[PDB]
Each structure stands twice: as C-alpha cells, then as structure tokens.
Design a protein around this ligand. Structure first.
Ligand SMILES: Cc1cc2nc3c(=O)[nH]c(=O)nc-3n(C[C@H](O)[C@H](O)[C@H](O)COP(=O)(O)O)c2cc1C
Ligand SMILES: Cc1cc2nc3c(=O)[nH]c(=O)nc-3n(C[C@H](O)[C@H](O)[C@H](O)COP(=O)(O)O)c2cc1C
Lengths: 133, 133
C-alpha cells in the first residue's frame, strides 16, 4: 500500500524543516530538503542543495553547538542544539536542530537526518517570563 | 539515490507526530504512524492502527475543532486545530493538529496527513505570561 510518494508527501507536510545530509570529509552536504526547510530559511532547494547547512550560521560562527555537533557526528551519535541562524534575507531566528544518524544498506555512505524547529517565539516567551518573574 | 527507506527514517526522526489516515465513511482510519506519534500518545502502532484518531479525545468530545475538521476534510481543504488530547495513561496534553489532504495516483482513495505537535508547554507559558502581564 504505502509508497515513496506518500512518504514524500508526509515529509513535505512537516511544520519543521527536515533534511538529509551526506558526509563529505569535513562537510555534510544537503541531499534532501522539504518544503518547511525552504520556507524556514528562505532558500530554495535548488540554491542550497549539496551545500553544508552551516551557511545558516552566516557570519555568526562562534557557536558552542558546532564542536558538539562535529563530535556527535564523528561518533555516530544523535545530537540536539539550539543555534543562531539567519534566513536568506538576513533575518535571525533560533533553530533547535536535531541530528540523527541513518542506517543505510550502504554503510560506506554516512547520512544524517536534520530536523529544524524555529524556536524563536519560545525563546522570546521564556525571556519575557524571566523578566517578569 | 534517495529511497523509501530513507524517507521512512526521515518521518521517524520527526519530533512531531506524523500520521496518514484514510477516509472510511464518517471515520478516517490510521494507516501510518511514526515513532513520535507512539511516544506522544502512549499507544503503540499495533494497538491503534486502522482506528480513527478521535480516540485521543477520550471522553472530552465537546470540542469546537471537530466540526471544522469534518468540514475541511469534506471540502478537501487543509486545517489546523489545537485540541485537548489524552495519552493512553490518561494524561492530558494540548495537541496542535495540522491536517493536509493528499494527492494520490488513486483518486478514489482519499488520504489525509496529520501532524501532531504537543503544544502543552507553549499553552502554559502563554498562561503564566498573561497572568503576570
Ligand atoms: C543533517 C544536518 C542538518 C544541519 N542543519 C543545520 C542547520 O539547520 N543550521 C545550522 O546552523 N547548522 C546545521 N547543521 C550543522 C552544520 O552543517 C555543521 O555540521 C556545523 O556547523 C558543525 O560543523 P562546522 O563547525 O564545520 O561548521 C546541520 C548538520 C547536519 C548533519
Ligand atoms: C490525519 C488525521 C489525524 C488526526 N489526528 C488527530 C489527533 O491527533 N487528535 C485528535 O483529537 N483528532 C485527530 N484527528 C481528528 C479525528 O480523527 C476526527 O476527524 C475529528 O474528531 C472530527 O471527526 P468526529 O467529529 O467524527 O470525531 C485527526 C484526523 C485526521 C484525518
């Protein structure tokens, strides 16, 4: 019954960004992005496919989650980090990124799934709540 | 390159519940659920597959989103509702449900994708913020 087209529709219905990246040395390049990722980042699939997602950090590269992400990937572990990210138009947003390793039928190829949740509203709500409390 | 297994892994990596339901008269019965849905609801895939998701409402059935959901489905429109839902152990949670119609190669069969986001923390954060403001 269920087919690849239906799973594709499921992935494109996600409110969170969903991507797959493939390890290419020190890069992990996008090989799949869903519609939510395009909307969240302001980049179209064609203009960022086969790039490392670190472009979302812009010039804001002094972020502690980077080293933990690299280490988790190297050790084949999942990880989750809240990162400062920037859309194509430069607008800032808080990105709660969840990275999961993938088991494939080709172990020589190493893939990671990324889930991007825009947590900007939640961060601001926590900030006001701390300011009033 | 990309295959159904990888899309399956993507769907199972989602933090939000992702399901597909098929119209069966006045019911729309689950034909696919991901791991997040099982965790969010406390039900395993085998015990709720081919059931209508309205079981998540428990005995709390006087909910305004129901009529709007039925109308959107009947008209082939997407919809989004925040519902009071209940896990298998009875614990309550706020469920922001996004329903999307599906285009299939068999138009006689009518499918809907459901995305379930647990918004309980966000609702409580909005409540405290209104109480202090
Ligand atoms: C699947 C996947 C998705 C990623 N998504 C993002 C993202 O949305 N935003 C971001 O800033 N970094 C993201 N990254 C992390 C960067 O691609 C990169 O791994 C990170 O910045 C650490 O490596 P670096 O220090 O060499 O840049 C993602 C990584 C992977 C593997
Ligand atoms: C794909 C899909 C997912 C749904 N997920 C939920 C859910 O998580 N929680 C819920 O309370 N209702 C959910 N519903 C709605 C119920 O299945 C049902 O359509 C709703 O209660 C309105 O119909 P009724 O008034 O006959 O119950 C979902 C419906 C669809 C089509």
């Amino acid at each position: 019954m269920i087919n690849a087209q239906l799973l594709q529709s499921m992935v494109d219905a996600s409110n969170d960004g969903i991507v797959v990246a493939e390890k290419e040395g020190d890069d992990t390049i996008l090989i799949y992005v869903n519609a939510a990722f395009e909307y969240l980042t302001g980049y179209s699939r064609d203009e960022i496919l086969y790039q490392d997602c670190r472009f979302l950090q812009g010039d804001d590269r002094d972020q502690l989650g980077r080293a933990r992400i690299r280490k988790a990937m190297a050790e084949g572990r999942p990880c989750r980090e809240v990162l400062r990210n920037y859309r194509k138009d430069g607008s800032a947003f808080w990105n709660e990124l969840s990275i999961t390793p993938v088991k494939s039928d080709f172990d020589q190829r190493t893939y990671f799934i990324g889930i991007q949740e825009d947590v900007s509203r939640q961060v601001e709500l926590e900030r006001e709540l701390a300011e009033l409390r």
